C-alpha cells in the first residue's frame, strides 16, 4: 500500500511520538484500541496531537496500524 505495512507506518510516523522510550503521546502498543477510534483521532487530531490527511496516511494504512498495535504485547 502507501506505507506497505502497519509496522512501517508506526516506525516512520506514529512511533516517533508514541513509542515507550519517547513518551510524547500515550503507549498504544497492546492496548486493544478499536480501528474506528484510531481512524477518528488521526483524522480529527486530538488536542496536542496533530491531524494527518488521507494524502499523508490513507484509510488502508490506518487499518494496518490498528491491527499491528493490537497484536503486540502490553
Amino acid at each position: 500500500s502507501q506505507w506497505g505495512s502497519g509496522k512501517n507506518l508506526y516506525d516512520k510516523v506514529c512511533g516517533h511520538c508514541h513509542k515507550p522510550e519517547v513518551g510524547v503521546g500515550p503507549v498504544l502498543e497492546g492496548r486493544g484500541l478499536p480501528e474506528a477510534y484510531i481512524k477518528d483521532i488521526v483524522r480529527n487530531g486530538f488536542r496536542a496531537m496533530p491531524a494527518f490527511p488521507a494524502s499523508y496516511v490513507d484509510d488502508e494504512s490506518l487499518t494496518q496500524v490498528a491491527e499491528y498495535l493490537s497484536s503486540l504485547p502490553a
Binding site: 516517533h16 488536542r47 496536542a48 491531524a51
Partner: protein, 515 residues
Amino acid sequence: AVLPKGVTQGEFNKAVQKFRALLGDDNVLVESDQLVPYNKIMMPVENAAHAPSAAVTATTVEQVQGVVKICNEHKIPIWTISTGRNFGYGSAAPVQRGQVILDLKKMNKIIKIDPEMCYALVEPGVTFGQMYDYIQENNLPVMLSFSAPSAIAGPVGNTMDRGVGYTPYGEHFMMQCGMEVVLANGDVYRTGMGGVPGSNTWQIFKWGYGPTLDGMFTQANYGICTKMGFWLMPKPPVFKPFEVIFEDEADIVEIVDALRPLRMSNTIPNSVVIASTLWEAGSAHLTRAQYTTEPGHTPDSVIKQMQKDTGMGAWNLYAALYGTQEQVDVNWKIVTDVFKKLGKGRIVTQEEAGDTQPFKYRAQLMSGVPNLQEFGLYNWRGGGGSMWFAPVSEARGSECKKQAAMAKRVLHKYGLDYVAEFIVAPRDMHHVIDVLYDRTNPEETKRADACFNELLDEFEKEGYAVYRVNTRFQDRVAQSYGPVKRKLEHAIKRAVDPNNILAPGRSGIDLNNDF
C-alpha cells in the same frame, strides 16, 4: 456549506466539476469528513475562521498548471501546502475561510541526490524522514538539516516559510539553490540556471543572470513551488556535541557576548540553541501539573525548585563541533578555554550525558538524525494551544536580556509562561517564544489572543518585528514593515496574479487591500 469569499455556489460547482475531470474523483475532496484533518489549528480562534471549501491533490506539474487555469476562470482562491506540518504557524489551514487547498503531499518524488557535489532536488511532498531513509539505504555520505518536526515535515514547505535547522547548514534558505515555480498564468519558471536548456548547474550556482528571484517566492503568494533544490553538508568523520548549563537568568548577557566571536569565526559552525529552563523542561517531558496546579504563570520559586530536582539551568546551551579528530580537538581546546575564562556554567559532554534527555535529541538534531522529542512542549500545559512569537535580535547580550524581560512581563500579565530559546547565527538571534495555552478552555484562548497582540505591540514599539507568524496575524505583522513595502508587494502581485487567485492574505498580500 462553506464557499470561497466572493464566489457563488454555482461558479464553485463548475470549478469542482472541472477539477474532477482533470484530476479524477479520488483527488477532489468536497465532503466535510475528508476536510476535517486540514482544519486542525493551535491558534486562539475557532476552526470555522480557517475552514477550507475543498481540497485537491495534484501529482504532476501538468496538473498544477491545470488547477491554476480552472482557478483563474472561476476566480477561485487556492492555498498551497507541501507537507502541511506548520504547527503554531497556521498548520494546513488557509489564511482565509473558504479557500481551496492545493495539497501537494502526493508529489513525493526525490529527483536527484548527488553525493559528490552534495545537493538534492526534491518535489513538495518529500519528507525529511523519506530523505533520511534514502540516505541510509544507499549509504550516501551526506547529512541533512531540518526543523524539529523533522521526520514528518519536509524541505520545500519549511524553506518556503524560511525555517531553521541546527547543523552548519541551519539557515535553510541560505542553502537553497534553484526552484521551479508554476506562475498564475500557467507558465513554469525556473530560477537561477534552470532556464538554460541542457543545464547541469541548477543546484550548483544560486544566482544565474539578471534579477535573482528565489527570495521573491519565499513567504509570498507569487507562485506554487513544484521542485526545489538545496545543498547538503558532507558527513564529517567526527561529530562532537556538547552542552553548557548556566544557573542565573541574568547570565544571558555574558553567554551571548562570549559565544559571538566563536560563531563569527566559525569555531562553533552550527546554529547554537540557548534554551530557557521551561523550554528545557517541556522537551524533557516534564508537565506543569507535577509541580503546581495554581492558576496563572509558573512562579520563580517553582522554577528554582525545578532546577534543583533535575539539574537544568536558567539557560542551557547546545552546540556542536564537526570535522576531523585533530580539527575537533583544537576547536574543543578553544571553546573550553572561553568558558573556563568566564568562570560560569558547567560543561556536559556526550560521555557524561549520552542516553539521557534532552541532550540526546539535541545531539540528534545537530547531526541530522530525526526525532519528534521537542513535541513535549505541547504537554507542558496541554490543550493543544500553541503559537510562535519569534522576534529578531542582534547577537548582542544586552539585547537578548531586554527582549527576554519584555516578553516575560507581557506573558505573565495574561497568566502564561516564558518558554523560549535563542537560535544563534553569527550576527542574529531567532528569539523563539512558544506562547502555550489550553485551547479547550475558552477564557484562556481569549487571553492568549490578547497576549499575542500585546506581544506584537510591545515589540514593534521598541523597533522589533517577527520573522514569521501564524495565518491569523499575517496581515498584522505586514504592518510592522511599513507602507512602502506593502505598496511594492501589491504592485508585483497585480503583475503576476491579476485575478488574485494565489493564496490572498499570505504575508498580508491581497489585491482586495488598498495598496
